[PDB]
């Protein structure tokens, strides 16, 4: 299972790639905000732009940035300006009526999107069934509401692979270093966490003593 | 999974193709004389056969058309006919004495087959068995009586995973979204629902949460 | 199991008395209000408690009648007065912080209480706990979302059985004849469904042949 | 698990009765008309009462007979007579809106009513609740539909052990050996078969040869 | 699990008594006959009640003789002379018509019944049902005819614990020391074999070693 | 299962406390400093007894208090003192040897005992050997070490299970709804959580759309 | 579930003691041997039981004295001695036809036996026949084979269960700390171990860490 | 499954070599120094080459040399020069966040690494997505700690199996014979072990006897 | 499965393989013994060889020989000259560290070894890992001390599955037939089995009545 990092934070993205585990990074409007708020800088499209950018270039992999437009049209429209800043760049989408239209469109126009805020293997069905590259399962929010979001990823996967469709799963919503563990388990593609979970992952203490 | 809409509704048709997940639709006679109804239009065989052309290019995948003829030499007529109308138009038979021995005949000539009003597993082997490409078991009419309509398409489903059949699967009379998420997880190659269905699929309250 | 009418209809109620297998109602203001619409009355106070009266006496059984209140001290005021409508009158409050203080307070006074709007073990745990008789899972609901209502159902009905909870679990948002079967199967209590399942349940073709 | 015929020959009973493993017999008009044909005596209402006596007193145990009626209050009626011809009698009534509102009817005055013609876990739900002492599903006839009989009587076993339900389950339409050995395995409290089964039973090769 | 002998060899009943786990006794004509050759005895009828009566008084539990009549009337009169030997003496019959026959007479009268050359389960529930006190399948000779006769006590056993039948099972026919284990983890009452068998049971490798 | 908040403040406890569910309380140091920080006065022994006897007072049931000793004499010293705080404290010790000299010892006095710090069923065992009325897996803990707690307290329940032991179960370090789901179904006594996760509990969107 | 050490160390004894976990001793010549050896004492019967006395009461709980007689009748003798000793003491035996002899007399004589050096499930069976109190498998020597020592003991625990025998179960040859959990978890009554292993159950990085 | 020698003995080495079933061997700083000794030479820089080249040499398979840096440069400058000493060399490196930087350049340089200290299954995904070609969860270890060492190699095992992850498995911390079997059926691809391991493999008392 | 005798009787070969399901034979120093008894010849080094040829011959498929030496250059050596008597031959060894070392130089000198006196998984694999094309585990000798012996196979065969190891299973030490149903459903590619037991697989008394 590869893994990404959820978050904009170019410290936090250079660490984890050093470790040469880093295979891409999801980041949202409000990821991107920490980043700037904690920089020296305002957020403008200009700034914007240069910081996927690099973060494109330092991961050397997939890099999600999420399009907030509500209509189809707007989202295509907004989906092709994300896509125009590294040809790295994924772009997210919702998993909405108008979400399902734009990821038609795009997809059909060899762009990749990443299908998030999926909670049932329903919407990660029609998400894939309009061309999704990706579809995001979050599995924190479910155990939120005190359902099982282990559940969710396992109903998803297992879907995937009976009707051996060609979407990739991302495991989403990451809130500890089991639901890293269930998700390579059940065959999810991608794992997709904080720095601290990530950070945890490699903690044990047995191995300490054994240094 | 492909997932396809039971009606004849182009409006509905319209709706669901454009969210990019519409592979095929499945009608009868009840159904288009309904489109018909909601319409100000008389139900002629010439504007018949329009309809059905108009959602084969609509959709721009299989259609099903049913007959309505009992007996098997006026059924292999019928069906004739109906496939006249489209390349994409796929036979609709029940699955009796008489549907068997037109669906041995249609599909020798070439033209696909549909059988329906499938009840049991063995009803469906016997329609593979004659040369159908896809075999109809009914969900929800099976709950209707008490009994889990589930375990038929599961016993279908296995059935001609066991036996290695190229017979295809199309869970029908759905009624609700598990009756969807549970054919994909079987294995089901398609589900025909109706547009209220297809509707609800979507929804879930933690994806509106996070817009 | 014991099962209930979801209804306000005095005609219904009877029909199914009748079949002497009617053993308690679940009200709520829409049902009610229905109730005097079809009939020529006005929704008064005082004709209100007049009906649920009726109800109580043509069932003879128990009746859950809603309150209304949102905040926990209105809703202790207008539960007490339900319950003092006729002692068949059980309580129904939502689920939430204000309906588990009033559910505490109510069961003090020796008051039963039904409560609803349950979407997760954890929400029934809690309500046990505060002190209701009765905790009623939504399983149509559920199903609405794409996820499997009676999996609520039987993590709700596990957890009070391996618990040793006294509180009875009442299978509710009943849609089709199989959410009756598995709710039976799996230890409900009770299941509480609308008139026209109710009318289902007895349907099988092999019963008509073989009459 | 107790033994009982499905015949009206006082012949079979007889033979079987010695074996001393009968524990009652069920019987319909037809078995009757075809044991008074036999036996080529008209079939009058003074030699029909006799009979079911003569049946009575030589199991020994108790002795279903079935009303005619399909209106509820001619079942009671009807119902009172066959329960008044012996004390061995149990009333047998199709599982029905009327059969249910004869069935609270007489089982409140008393009398024994077993609910036949069951074929969904629902109905023997329904009959168990209406007071039947007896409830009984048909296995051979859901194996003539292509559906597994067993899994039908399973169901209502188990959700009758489940729901801790004072009901006894009479398993039917008895056709091979097996069916037997699988209610016995199952849980069912009785079954009842032809004449021609019961011969079968005890029969094996080992055995002879072990003779 | 109680230890039964299959023999009527006063010196192997008294070796293996000595070591405190004999509970009872199986013996049948050719094996009485093998004990009176080994003397220069005659088998006549007060010789052999004599032998019985010792093998009684020296196992200290119950003692299996089999009848030799073919004729419920015979089996019966045969039954009532071997009881009368000894009160620790338990009839054994074979299950066919007449031995059910003389099974329901013997133990009407109090002498406790031992149904034996059982091999299916319906055989097994038939004695049960006639009044048997144990019931002896024969693991070993289903064996014989590449059958699991392990699955033939199996079924027995949880027909018999399902169905709450006073009678006990004797797994016979023991050819092997694993048969005993089989046995006893499938929850047979008693298990009967000969000398060489108990000879075995005791030994390994580990044991001898660990002396 | 009985629910308690793993926390030192007032303000929660009393809001919990008002919902009817809450069962008891768990402190430790830490949890007690950061309580007095919160209102901003001096921590002293005086205060330190005066606060703990509010928590007991307001929850109405067990409160654990930590003692901080490691040597058994100490620890013993500490536990005394702090029982006499109020009859329903509950002495926390660290499963440890010097934890088990010292929870004999407290035990055989009459003062409860809960072990903490337990991390594997064999700590448990032994705990409950000593006589801990209560023993403390820490879920929460296990899972940031990559390994599955629920895990561990499944172990530990089902020895406790198996071997009939007395000893009540707290799942402790509970970082989520669905740790106290898990708990409740593996048949957990009890589960002390923060109050954060105290309130998601209640948390659902079908309830909210609901009301 | 009890625990034990086997060992004839009265430091090592009151070490564990001292914890209020020891529930038993079990001892063998070659251990008490070392106990004088490492004193410098000499072995004399006086002595020696004077020794064992010492255990029995610092241990306050059964005590196992090995006898070394090889035949039935001088076991006996000196299992008489040994019970002498003191009222704890359990006479322990070789799984043989000798053990067996001197098992059955000696629990007659009302004297506790414990029979040990079982390896498999009939050995169980006959030691529980023959008056046995305890059975004590082997599994470290198990696995010093290549067998799956813990399923030595699986099959043991099952078929006492199954077969409701009274006597109690000692996992003995323990060899590490997993043994024991393993023993507890399969339902044993009974662990026994040395010293060592004792020290090492209590050992986790996480509870060292959280002190 | 390929076996291991855990040793720097050249004897050893020998031997196990001449049974044909030695695949590799894994070292170890102590494990040198421990050779060296017994042999009579202090290792230096090219003594130790030549042992190591004379390991490889004799097995004729992989042998893992530790790295002793902590910092990932030196790790990586030592990794490069054990590499070169032969080429059958694999760098052995610890996992942690500074053997993982060292991983991801010495396997890019074509070097072969062996991820240690692991023990969890999140560990082992990110030695593996580090370019890992071995990984080596420590069984022992883990059971001294009273958890399942064989479940953390079944977690590592399926999810590198599941991922389809390039990595092979080698279980270390061997302890017992059955630590081998359960490598082995766990799926484990290497096994390595100390020498008196090996030496009781081949132990069984019925291969004794059958000489 | 394939078909092996265990034998040197030309004759009893001859009438087998007239069955034509006789795929190889196993012969061992007293089996040839008895041919060469009851046959008019002595045993000499040209007779021996002969013999062997002609078995070969006869059978058209693999025989095994065993060899008597007990160190590994004389097994080889004894080995060397089996397969020169003809191709077919193949040597049998014993599991030891001598025959070990031997099959390690045979089979690398293209001769195929039959590892036998197998009573463990472990052993099995060190064969497996030696060289060996079959390991021979003996069934019948592990039931004689009480233990399951198709576990042995069972985890033979699976661990063989799982490592993909290239050796066959030979079911050795047949002592009846569901020995060879046993071996076969659980995978091993051959059992060997001695002409009684061959003559017991097709009896069957419904296939004789069948006749």
Same mark, same amino acid.
């Given at each position: 299972?590869? +893994?990404?990092?959820?978050?904009?934070? +170019?410290?936090?993205?250079?660490?984890? &790639?050093?470790?040469?585990?880093? =295979?891409?990074?999801?980041?949202?409007?409000?990821?991107?905000?920490?980043?700037? &708020?904690?920089?020296?800088?305002?957020?403008?499209?200009?700034?914007?732009?240069?910081?996927?950018?690099?973060?494109?270039?330092?991961?050397?992999?997939?890099?999600?940035?999420?399009?907030?437009?509500?209509?189809?049209?707007?989202?295509?429209?907004?989906?092709?300006?994300?896509?125009?800043?590294?040809?790295?760049?994924?772009?997210?989408?919702?998993?909405?009526?108008? #979400? $399902?239209?734009?990821?038609?469109? +795009? =997809?059909?126009?060899?762009?990749?999107?990443?299908?998030?805020?999926?909670?049932?293997?329903?919407?990660? +069905? $029609?998400?894939?069934?309009?061309?999704?590259?990706?579809?995001?399962?979050?599995?924190?929010?479910?155990?939120?509401? =005190?359902?099982?979001?282990?559940? $969710?990823?396992?109903?998803?996967?297992?879907?995937?692979?009976?009707?051996?469709?060609?979407?990739? /799963?991302? &495991?989403?919503?990451?809130?500890?270093?089991?639901?890293?563990?269930?998700? &390579?388990?059940? #065959?999810?593609?991608?794992?997709?966490?904080?720095?601290? /979970?990530?950070?945890?992952?490699?903690?044990?203490?047995?191995?300490?003593?054994?240094?």
């Amino acid at each position: 299972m590869e +893994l990404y990092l959820d978050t904009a934070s +170019l410290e936090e993205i250079r660490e984890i &790639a050093a470790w040469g585990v880093l =295979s891409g990074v999801t980041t949202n409007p409000t990821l991107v905000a920490k980043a700037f &708020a904690a920089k020296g800088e305002a957020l403008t499209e200009e700034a914007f732009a240069a910081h996927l950018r690099a973060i494109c270039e330092t991961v050397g992999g997939p890099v999600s940035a999420e399009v907030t437009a509500l209509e189809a049209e707007a989202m295509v429209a907004e989906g092709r300006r994300l896509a125009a800043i590294h040809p790295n760049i994924v772009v997210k989408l919702p998993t909405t009526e108008e #979400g $399902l239209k734009a990821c038609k469109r +795009l =997809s059909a126009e060899g762009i990749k999107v990443n299908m998030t805020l999926i909670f049932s293997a329903n919407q990660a +069905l $029609l998400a894939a069934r309009a061309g999704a590259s990706y579809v995001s399962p979050f599995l924190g929010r479910v155990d939120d509401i =005190s359902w099982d979001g282990g559940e $969710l990823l396992r109903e998803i996967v297992e879907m995937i692979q009976v009707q051996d469709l060609p979407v990739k /799963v991302i &495991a989403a919503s990451i809130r500890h270093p089991r639901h890293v563990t269930e998700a &390579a388990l059940l #065959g999810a593609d991608i794992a997709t966490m904080p720095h601290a /979970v990530f950070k945890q992952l490699l903690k044990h203490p047995l191995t300490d003593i054994g240094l």
